[PDB]
Amino acid sequence: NVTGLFKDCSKVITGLHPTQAPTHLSVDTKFKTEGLCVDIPGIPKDMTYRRLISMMGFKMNYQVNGYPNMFITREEAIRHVRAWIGFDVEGCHATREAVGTNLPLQLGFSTGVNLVAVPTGYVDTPNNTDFSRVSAKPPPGDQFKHLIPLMYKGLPWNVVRIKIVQMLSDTLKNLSDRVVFVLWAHGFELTSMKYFVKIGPERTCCLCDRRATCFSTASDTYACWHHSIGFDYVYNPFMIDVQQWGFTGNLQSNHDLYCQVHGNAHVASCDAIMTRCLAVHECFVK
Amino acid sequence: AGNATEVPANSTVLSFCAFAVDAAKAYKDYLASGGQPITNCVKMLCTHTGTGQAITVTPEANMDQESFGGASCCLYCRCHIDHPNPKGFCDLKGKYVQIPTTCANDPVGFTLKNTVCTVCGMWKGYGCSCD
Ligand SMILES: [Zn+2]
Ligand SMILES: [Zn+2]
Ligand SMILES: [Zn+2]
Ligand SMILES: [Zn+2]
């Protein structure tokens, strides 16, 4: 019937004018009749709206010739263990002018790095989509209290994505020609990848013959991990969701079955470390 | 909380094009690999006695066309991504777009591949009177 992908999270009670609605579903009911929509003389377009559009619910099950698929099998992931980077994101929630969606706040990786982003969302307007800071708050509850100070320490996304590319490049350039993000319950990590990942056919580096792992919007060029200085996007990453391998219960309980050297520090990087560690113990140990 | 805009039949294509470096190319390739066109567009009822111009303030379909809400026919509006104009603004959102009936099964693909004549206001190859 309907999906939550691109849900309108605004608090506006009415739908959109037929010329402005992205979809038939989003047109206001007043224009709907006889199976379709009508233009109503005297009923104007809305020239000031800002409607937050949710990025929760992507489905990367495309099958398009020459485009690699992002999600890989366990067997393929094992061959690429040196490319494994655990990844976890802690979110904040849209508030005030919008409600109903999760925005990236703290991005953590198995390298130990946490990056903090300004709460940023995709706001439809009469003229475009405005990728912009939005009102947000951490979820309530003692287990989320550590996110409170991060609400004022975020970097703009144009800075955050450069730092992600640099970190991945520094970590992986002598380990692999790719990255495999190792995830646990991947939905929100996939949402967060919309902010720093692009895809397309396989490409090569501007400066050598390796496969491209990075893309620059400044020049519309591609680079491998050795030549990506200043690049802003991760290009054609791979990924796998460890939760799907048959575990029950939370990440920590399964990680702790095999490992006593990663106490839970309750931060995105620690979840990312535990996820990669669990995967490694499951596939390579005993 | 919130109000859905989309249907499941569009999840795959919209996710693919929302992540693509080149969204127009991704949509073209998606179709060439057998994917179904984006559905859930805003199709209008009208009198089919209009001017036939491509992009208009109210529905203007002639008998060879259908009228659609403009944002719903724009890949960049549908995927909530950047537009390719210099200033990043859309020429379809806020207008109605007339689509030849022979192409009305895929309005988004039609607008991606076609060009409006700035002299006569009709689509090149689908009404332009200039030659
Ligand atoms: Zn290179
Ligand atoms: Zn461990
Ligand atoms: Zn548009
Ligand atoms: Zn012409």
Curated annotation (Swiss-Prot), chain A:
<feature type="active site">
    <location>
        <position position="88"/>
    </location>
</feature>
<feature type="active site">
    <location>
        <position position="189"/>
    </location>
</feature>
<feature type="domain" description="ExoN">
    <location>
        <begin position="70"/>
        <end position="285"/>
    </location>
</feature>
<feature type="binding site">
    <location>
        <position position="255"/>
    </location>
    <ligand>
        <name>Zn(2+) 15</name>
    </ligand>
</feature>
<feature type="binding site">
    <location>
        <position position="205"/>
    </location>
    <ligand>
        <name>Zn(2+) 14</name>
    </ligand>
</feature>
<feature type="binding site">
    <location>
        <position position="277"/>
    </location>
    <ligand>
        <name>Zn(2+) 15</name>
    </ligand>
</feature>
<feature type="binding site">
    <location>
        <position position="266"/>
    </location>
    <ligand>
        <name>Mg(2+) 2</name>
    </ligand>
</feature>
<feature type="binding site">
    <location>
        <position position="208"/>
    </location>
    <ligand>
        <name>Zn(2+) 14</name>
    </ligand>
</feature>
<feature type="binding site">
    <location>
        <position position="259"/>
    </location>
    <ligand>
        <name>Zn(2+) 15</name>
    </ligand>
</feature>
<feature type="binding site">
    <location>
        <position position="227"/>
    </location>
    <ligand>
        <name>Zn(2+) 14</name>
    </ligand>
</feature>
<comment type="subunit">
    <text>Interacts (via N-terminus) with DDX1. Interacts with nsp10.</text>
</comment>
<feature type="binding site">
    <location>
        <position position="189"/>
    </location>
    <ligand>
        <name>Mg(2+) 1</name>
    </ligand>
</feature>
<feature type="binding site">
    <location>
        <position position="271"/>
    </location>
    <ligand>
        <name>Mg(2+) 2</name>
    </ligand>
</feature>
<protein>
    <recommendedName>
        <fullName>Guanine-N7 methyltransferase nsp14</fullName>
    </recommendedName>
</protein>
<comment type="function">
    <text>Plays a role in viral RNA synthesis through two distinct activities. The N7-guanine methyltransferase activity plays a role in the formation of the cap structure GpppA-RNA. The proofreading exoribonuclease reduces the sensitivity of the virus to RNA mutagens during replication. This activity acts on both ssRNA and dsRNA in a 3'-5' direction.</text>
</comment>
<feature type="binding site">
    <location>
        <position position="90"/>
    </location>
    <ligand>
        <name>Mg(2+) 2</name>
    </ligand>
</feature>
<feature type="active site">
    <location>
        <position position="90"/>
    </location>
</feature>
<feature type="binding site">
    <location>
        <position position="88"/>
    </location>
    <ligand>
        <name>Mg(2+) 1</name>
    </ligand>
</feature>
<feature type="active site">
    <location>
        <position position="266"/>
    </location>
</feature>
<feature type="binding site">
    <location>
        <position position="224"/>
    </location>
    <ligand>
        <name>Zn(2+) 14</name>
    </ligand>
</feature>
<feature type="binding site">
    <location>
        <position position="262"/>
    </location>
    <ligand>
        <name>Zn(2+) 15</name>
    </ligand>
</feature>
<feature type="active site">
    <location>
        <position position="271"/>
    </location>
</feature>
UniProtKB/Swiss-Prot annotation, chain B:
<feature type="binding site">
    <location>
        <position position="117"/>
    </location>
    <ligand>
        <name>Zn(2+) 8</name>
    </ligand>
</feature>
<feature type="binding site">
    <location>
        <position position="77"/>
    </location>
    <ligand>
        <name>Zn(2+) 7</name>
    </ligand>
</feature>
<feature type="binding site">
    <location>
        <position position="90"/>
    </location>
    <ligand>
        <name>Zn(2+) 7</name>
    </ligand>
</feature>
<feature type="binding site">
    <location>
        <position position="83"/>
    </location>
    <ligand>
        <name>Zn(2+) 7</name>
    </ligand>
</feature>
<comment type="function">
    <text>Plays a pivotal role in viral transcription by stimulating both nsp14 3'-5' exoribonuclease and nsp16 2'-O-methyltransferase activities. Therefore plays an essential role in viral mRNAs cap methylation.</text>
</comment>
<feature type="domain" description="ExoN/MTase coactivator">
    <location>
        <begin position="1"/>
        <end position="131"/>
    </location>
</feature>
<feature type="binding site">
    <location>
        <position position="74"/>
    </location>
    <ligand>
        <name>Zn(2+) 7</name>
    </ligand>
</feature>
<comment type="subunit">
    <text>Forms a dodecamer and interacts with nsp14 and nsp16; these interactions enhance nsp14 and nsp16 enzymatic activities.</text>
</comment>
<protein>
    <recommendedName>
        <fullName>Non-structural protein 10</fullName>
    </recommendedName>
</protein>
<feature type="binding site">
    <location>
        <position position="128"/>
    </location>
    <ligand>
        <name>Zn(2+) 8</name>
    </ligand>
</feature>
<feature type="binding site">
    <location>
        <position position="130"/>
    </location>
    <ligand>
        <name>Zn(2+) 8</name>
    </ligand>
</feature>
<feature type="binding site">
    <location>
        <position position="120"/>
    </location>
    <ligand>
        <name>Zn(2+) 8</name>
    </ligand>
</feature>
